[PDB]
Amino acid sequence: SGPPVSELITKAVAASKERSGVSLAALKKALAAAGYDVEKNNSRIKLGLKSLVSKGTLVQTKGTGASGSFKLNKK
Template sequence: KKALKAGGYDVEKNKTRLLIAIKRLVASKTLVRNKGSFKLNK
């Protein structure tokens, strides 16, 4: 979220889209949970 906000993306307006995208990436194992944050899978 911080990186998107720094790039000029309206995070508050598109919060639900972000949540859905994050859930989809975790389900497809592209993102991995890491103690309260996420990292890209190798």
């Protein structure tokens, strides 16, 4: 079963904490290495990361939308 996608993307972004934000490609590779159906839930995880950006829990670093980089919030 597993948790909802918010859990997985939060450890995807919190796995490394690079100086710049984690890119969409790097977080996709992280979720692939940890194990998740990125093949089919790609629209699902894109709307999920869009949701977490809109909730303000996550902040997009460089790009807008799914492109660019993403990092954790201030506090």
